[PDB]
Structure formats: structure tokens, C-alpha cells
Design an enzyme around this catalytic site. Sequence first.
Site, PDB file in Angstrom:
ATOM      1  N   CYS A  46       2.201  -3.454  14.127  1.00 48.46           N
ATOM      2  CA  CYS A  46       1.418  -2.307  15.216  1.00 48.46           C
ATOM      3  C   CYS A  46       0.964  -3.177  16.022  1.00 48.46           C
ATOM      4  O   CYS A  46      -0.192  -2.371  17.589  1.00 48.46           O
ATOM      5  CB  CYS A  46       0.672  -1.459  14.112  1.00 48.46           C
ATOM      6  SG  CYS A  46      -0.500  -2.487  13.585  1.00 48.46           S
ATOM      7  N   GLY A  54       1.233  -1.313   0.099  1.00 47.61           N
ATOM      8  CA  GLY A  54      -0.289   0.068   0.119  1.00 47.61           C
ATOM      9  C   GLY A  54       0.983   1.543   0.099  1.00 47.61           C
ATOM     10  O   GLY A  54       0.533   1.642  -0.537  1.00 47.61           O
ATOM     11  N   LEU A  55       1.570   0.853   1.431  1.00 44.35           N
ATOM     12  CA  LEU A  55       2.258   2.485   0.967  1.00 44.35           C
ATOM     13  C   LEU A  55       3.328   2.703  -0.281  1.00 44.35           C
ATOM     14  O   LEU A  55       3.875   3.914  -0.825  1.00 44.35           O
ATOM     15  CB  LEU A  55       3.721   2.112   2.050  1.00 44.35           C
ATOM     16  CG  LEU A  55       5.049   3.277   2.421  1.00 44.35           C
ATOM     17  CD1 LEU A  55       4.365   4.542   1.979  1.00 44.35           C
ATOM     18  CD2 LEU A  55       5.650   3.176   3.833  1.00 44.35           C
ATOM     19  N   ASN A 103      -3.392  -4.479   6.823  1.00 42.45           N
ATOM     20  CA  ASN A 103      -2.512  -3.847   7.614  1.00 42.45           C
ATOM     21  C   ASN A 103      -1.442  -2.585   6.741  1.00 42.45           C
ATOM     22  O   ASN A 103      -1.105  -2.327   7.148  1.00 42.45           O
ATOM     23  CB  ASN A 103      -0.938  -5.004   7.770  1.00 42.45           C
ATOM     24  CG  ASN A 103      -1.034  -6.370   8.743  1.00 42.45           C
ATOM     25  OD1 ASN A 103      -2.014  -5.946   9.498  1.00 42.45           O
ATOM     26  ND2 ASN A 103      -0.698  -7.512   7.944  1.00 42.45           N
ATOM     27  N   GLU A 150       9.639  -9.136   2.990  1.00 41.29           N
ATOM     28  CA  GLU A 150       7.664  -9.688   3.590  1.00 41.29           C
ATOM     29  C   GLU A 150       8.386 -10.317   3.955  1.00 41.29           C
ATOM     30  O   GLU A 150       8.115 -11.691   3.154  1.00 41.29           O
ATOM     31  CB  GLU A 150       6.995  -8.892   2.791  1.00 41.29           C
ATOM     32  CG  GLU A 150       5.237  -9.384   3.032  1.00 41.29           C
ATOM     33  CD  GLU A 150       4.719  -9.459   3.791  1.00 41.29           C
ATOM     34  OE1 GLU A 150       5.131  -8.090   4.822  1.00 41.29           O
ATOM     35  OE2 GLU A 150       5.150  -9.918   5.670  1.00 41.29           O
TER      36      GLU A 150
END
Length: 817
Positions: free
Chosen positions: A443, A367-368, A795, A385
Amino acid sequence: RISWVGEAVKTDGKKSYYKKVCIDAETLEVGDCVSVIPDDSSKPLYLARVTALWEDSSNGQMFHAHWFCAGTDTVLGATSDPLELFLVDECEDMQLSYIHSKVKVIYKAPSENWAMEGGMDKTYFYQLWYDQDYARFESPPKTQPNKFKFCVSCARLAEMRQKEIPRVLEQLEDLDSRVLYYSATKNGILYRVGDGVYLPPEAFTFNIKPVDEDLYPEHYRKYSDYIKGSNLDAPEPYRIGRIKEIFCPKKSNGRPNETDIKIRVNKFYRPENTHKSTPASYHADINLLYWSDEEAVVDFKAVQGRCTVEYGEDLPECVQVYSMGGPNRFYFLEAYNAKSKSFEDPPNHARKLPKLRTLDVFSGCGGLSEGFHQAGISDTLWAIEMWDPAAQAFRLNNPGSTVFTEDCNILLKLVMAGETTNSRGQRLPQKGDVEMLCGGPPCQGFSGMNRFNSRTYSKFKNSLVVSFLSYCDYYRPRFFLLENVRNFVSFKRSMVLKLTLRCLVRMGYQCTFGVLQAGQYGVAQTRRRAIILAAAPGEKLPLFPEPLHVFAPRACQLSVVVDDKKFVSNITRLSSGPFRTITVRDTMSDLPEVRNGASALEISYNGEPQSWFQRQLRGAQYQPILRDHICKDMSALVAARMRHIPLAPGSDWRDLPNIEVRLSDGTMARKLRYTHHDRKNGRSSSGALRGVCSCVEAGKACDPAARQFNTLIPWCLPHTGNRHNHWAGLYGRLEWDGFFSTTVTNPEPMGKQGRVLHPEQHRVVSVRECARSQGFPDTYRLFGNILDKHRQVGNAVPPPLAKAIGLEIKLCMLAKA
DNA sequence: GAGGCCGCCTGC
DNA sequence: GCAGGTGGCCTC
Ligand SMILES: C[S@@+](CC[C@H](N)C(=O)[O-])C[C@H]1O[C@@H](n2cnc3c(N)ncnc32)[C@H](O)[C@@H]1O
Ligand SMILES: [Zn+2]
Ligand SMILES: [Zn+2]
């Protein structure tokens, strides 16, 4: 005792300046650094640089003091080096009698070889300049002196004053009552006649206009009348006008009062401002306007910013390419006649930077990285990842990327040992390869939902945040970004935040932090994320992006308190914004109905996109297939619960009927019966009790006798509701006009983020709907089973948020060289 | 695996 | 008291 060295360099009015002075045995010259004892004998000594030396004809001998900032007075607190100072824009004239002694301070400049100095492990010094309101550390300014007694703090404070002041520039015509100007400036922005202006929504107006308590027992727990996820309190977006005149009132003697700049504008209509009101916005582009002949006068001081408003037909390149090629861009194709409530044609008078090679650590599905790519700043050449499904998703969306399915600690240890490939044969990135470093560390430890965050992680030296900082230290990228949940800034009394900033400062990075609200950048989701930005010594430190969309004010509390000091970001758009808020309707009204348990991975859309947001996310190229519009298969009991939640806004578990129902299982949902008595809660109209456990009174304990199973109303929600705000939103429906709560990794109706029911269909939101809530393009590939996909989406950094950040980094790339 | 269950802190 | 939190753990 105190005597001047030499004669007077310059002589002004009451003050007579000198170049060097002698006190007792020491001798001080402009440039030397000195110390001063406080006006309160308790505090430590202050440190300052001498800027000027003079004596005035009334008071004693004087000097100009440009103060340093001690490390502990910054956000770093007691994690700062005791010898490190920071440059600040604070200074004052002082009597020489306050000077305690001369002090040596060294400027610790980064090396010409600073990028290669990573991965190797009694005097005051400074390396960085600190902003105390925005918690920014930046490279010292290069303001050059014509300025003999030159104070850089004074120089910047004056620049800053001339920037904020509204001034007129080129004159135009002198009229009877006022003088017209062709242009003016404010906050560094040039405004000309014909430009578009943002105006506060109150700058001008438009010339247009008891339940049955036996059956629903838990309904009394909705006394709050506060509707989660609702858009009744979001402010109006900016008024938009075209500058018709810039004029100053002329004094009786004819000279213009340039203290009181006014502008006359033509009013532009958003669709929702016409008589067609709010529904007009559902299909319209978010930057579509209508010209109008209505005019208004406002003060120039009220202008919130400049924008471009073009007649669409005259544009070279199409509306979409125009709207994507720049900020603050609006267009119109028709005019709006308010008195006739009709749309006429508008009158005639209305008419090579290479990308950063990026390493994405904890990349997820991307996403980033997707956001950064959309901003046009980066090619994510490497991703790390450890979880295989997400690494597969990243590979599908990024074919020319090298994706490492490795523990990031293992891979860094291999690079530092001198390895060239990992065990798969993939080439490891080396120093100089990596120009940007971005990542969202896990997180789960920082999330406030985690009830057990002390069980398997309580060591900062071994956390994944420190692993990520080791990557930054090793590769010394030009830019660095760390993302996490808001609570990252207050976890453990803000020590993780302080030690992260301390670590970057020790590397020589400029850095800063802030909290952003994703909904303000164009998703129908409340999602507050902490962002640490860093920039290499030769770079400009990015600013945080101004909000693009209005959003509910409760969800936009972005301040951070660190050791009693409140911190804000650079963001100035606090009460409004250029674009309307994105709603659940904008996000997913076009998706076809599916059932609980929907498993068809590839279906038909059954129609064209309906909203601007859907048009953007579905893309230009026609898409014949809708992917991943699939839902978890909830049990017969949970499915029956969902089927019984009303469709009206604000409906959640508290609206459930207290009935037995025959489940599709053949099994039977049982009725919840209120055994015990909660004096704090009371009894219904019928006189029935409202307790369900021996815990409801005094300091008693839980016994399994009163615990009821398989009840349509889940037993655990009345059980602990009094200390959890009545579990508002659990089994809650989204509202078409509202927004999503934070999209997590697994949408559960009884989770803490329980508002996961579709506004109308009796199901949990689909993977596609969650992706839409996160701003993913519909073509963005996920991988694995449905729970893998929900996790990949939950996420992720929303790509519209990452894109906003990325455009701020782009300005720094263009401003360097 | 799937659902039930459900602490504490910042901020107000 | 109210509102929010890219959730963990336990049991079957
Ligand atoms: C919260 S996700 C971030 C996703 C990404 N920022 C995005 O926008 O899609 C963090 C990822 O790090 C991965 N991860 C956890 N521990 C890791 C480790 N030790 N090394 C590498 N990756 C790890 C997890 O599998 C998870 O997908
Ligand atoms: Zn000064
Ligand atoms: Zn109990």
C-alpha cells in the site's frame, strides 16, 4: 406504415396486446432488441429488449422497453469494451414511434471450461447484470416466467417491492380495539411473537434517569476543541426488545388496518442502561442483557432487524459456544428492577461444509488468513511472502501450510512455464488446486502519507496489483478478495480501481468494491480499507458485512466518488448497530506496566482478563505467559518529551512545557525560543513572538540560522504547523475511552500517525498493544526483531474484519449448493 | 541503522 | 480552513 402481425394475444382494459408487429420492412417480435434515439438529440442511442407489444384505446401503439446499460455508464467508465452492455433493472412503456431500428445483441455466457481458460495472453454483447447504486456486476438472474409479455426487470422490481413491505401473516386473536397476529415479515425477515427485535436507540427510553502562556507556548494551537480518537460522538447501539404482541388497529367496521402494523415489546437492559451506567460495560460480555418488565409500543416499520435473546441457564451448550455459533445472539441471566435498582431472578415467563483451499498472496504474518480461518471457510494451504520475517511468522501460525518466500512474479512465471516445484523443493499450486485467492498488495504507493509516490512506480501494467490479477486470471478461483488502503479507490482519479474492475469483468467474474471501517467490526481502531470482492460465474457474489459495533461517525465516511458518480456498498446499518464500541480500555487495560525500551519477550500477565474483548483475545485455554509486550527504546530526548505529555484526554505535543530538562543521557534538552513573527499567528499574553523561521512571513525562504536543535518542543512542528492542522496528535496520548488511530508499520510519535503514546505510561504502545488494536489473538505468533514485529502487525488486515467478510462468503457457499 | 522533516488530494 | 492517510527520504 405500422401494422400488427396477427390478432390480439390478450385484451385487458384500454390496452390490446399483440405478439409480433411490422414497421416498414423490418418485423419485430417479443425478445428482439431495438434502439431508440434520446429525447435530447445529443446523447448516444439507447438500447433495449422488447418485452411486450400492444396498443391502447387512447394513445398510440406501445411496447415495453427493458433497457441495457452501456459500459461507460457503469463504474468502468471509458475503460469498458465499446460493445459490452450490462443488464439493469430499468424499464418503461414506450410508444413504438420511438424505436429507431432493430439491433443484434449476443449473450456471452461463460464456458463450461471457464476455469481452465486463464493464462493464454464486432457486435453488441452482454455477460453480466449491473447494480448502479452498489457498483455490483453479477451473473444474470434466472427469474423464469403465465407471463407471456414477461419483463425480468418488472419481475424483480415487484419481488423487491413485496420484500420491503411490512406485512402481517398468521392472525391470532381479535380483540376490542385491535387484531393480534402471531407473525409478520419485513425486508424478507420473519418476525414471530417472542422473537428479539433491534430497535433504533430513540425508539423507547428506559425507566432509569486559561493557562500560563509563557510556560506552555504552543498551547494556543489547540483552539479547535476537537479531540482526535474520542468516543463522545459515537451513537448508541440498538435498543433490544422481545416481541410481546403484533397488532393492527381495527377500523370502525372491524376490519384490521394492515397498513399500520405495531408491535408491543419487553425492554431489555444493557448493563450501561442500568443505574450502574457506563462502567458496567467494562467487564460485561458485549451481548449480555438484563430482562425487564418494562413494555413499549413501537411501529413495526421501526424494526432494524431480528435477533436471538435467550435465557442463559436454559441453553444447551454453554454461553460461549452459543455466542460464537451465530449472529445477533444475546443472552440474559437476571432481570433488572429499575424502581428498586436491583437484580432479581427473571420471571418464569421469560423462559459439514468443506473449506476452500486458499492461496494468500502478500500473506504477511497472516491477519487476513487468520480471519478467514476463524470464519470457518478456508484452509490457507499456500502463502506467498517475499519478506522472510513475515513468512516465518506465517509458518509459525500455519504448520500445514506451504509458505513460499518468493517474489510472486517469479513464482507465477514458473507455474506458467510448467514447473512443478520452486527452487526449495516446494510443490507449486496448479489449476484446480486454488479455490479461493486472497491478498493485500503493498500500500506504500497508494497511501496518502506517501509524499514521493511518483518516483519509482507509475506504470499500471507492471504493478503488483496486476500481478495479483494475473494470479486470479490463471487459477480462476471460486472467490477473490483484494484489500488495500482507502485511497486505492481514488488514486489517479480512480483509474487503478476502474482498471481492476475492468480486468475482472473481462475474465468473466462477478465483482464489486466497497470501503469498510475496521472499528465497525470490533477493534478500537479507525482503519478504512478498500475491498474488491469477486466471485466465479457459478457462484453468488458476496455482500459486504453489516457493521457489528457502533463507531464514531466522522471515521465512517465510506462513500466513493468515481467520475462524479457517488457509490455506496450494500450496508444499511448507517446510524446504529447491535454492539457497543470497543475502546482502548477494552483493548489493553489488562496489560502490565512496562518501561520505555521494554525488551522482556515473555512476562506475566499479573491477572485475569478484565474485558470481554480481552477474554476473547486471550482465549479459553489458560495462558501463563504474555508474549511480545515490548516497546521501542526511544532516545533520551524523545523519552523526556513523552514524560512531559499530560495524561488528560487530547494531550499531544502542543501541551509541552518550554523548559530545559536534564536527560537520562547526561545531555540537555534545550529551550525553544520564538525568533520570527507570524502575523497570521500573533503573540502570546507575554507579547512574545510565535515564529521560529524566516518562512513564516510572505514568500521568503528557509535559512539555517533560526532552526533550533535538541529542543524539547520539536522545532519542525511549529515550523510547518500552520499548513498541517497544527500537527494534532503528534506525541499524542491514547484515551482509555477512545480508539487507536490507524496502526502503521512503525509507531513514531513524530510520524504523521503520531498518537502512539500510552494513556498513562511514558512510552510508545507495545507490539502486543498494537496487535491488540488489530484484533490479533494473544497466541498469534510474530517473528523477528521488534521493528519486524511492528511491521507484521501494522501491515495486516484485522482478523475481526477479515472474519466478518469471511462469514459473508460462507453464506454464498451455503446458497450455491 | 534512528530521528528529523514534512506534499498533496479527497471530502467537508 | 479542517481532517485524514498499512509513509519516504535525507542526514549523521
Ligand atoms: C501489506 S502486507 C499484507 C499482510 C497480510 N494481508 C496480513 O493480513 O497480515 C504485504 C506483504 O507483501 C510482501 N511483498 C512485497 N512485495 C512482494 C512480492 N513482489 N512478492 C511477494 N510478496 C511481496 C511484503 O513483504 C508484505 O509483507
Ligand atoms: Zn419492465
Ligand atoms: Zn522555514
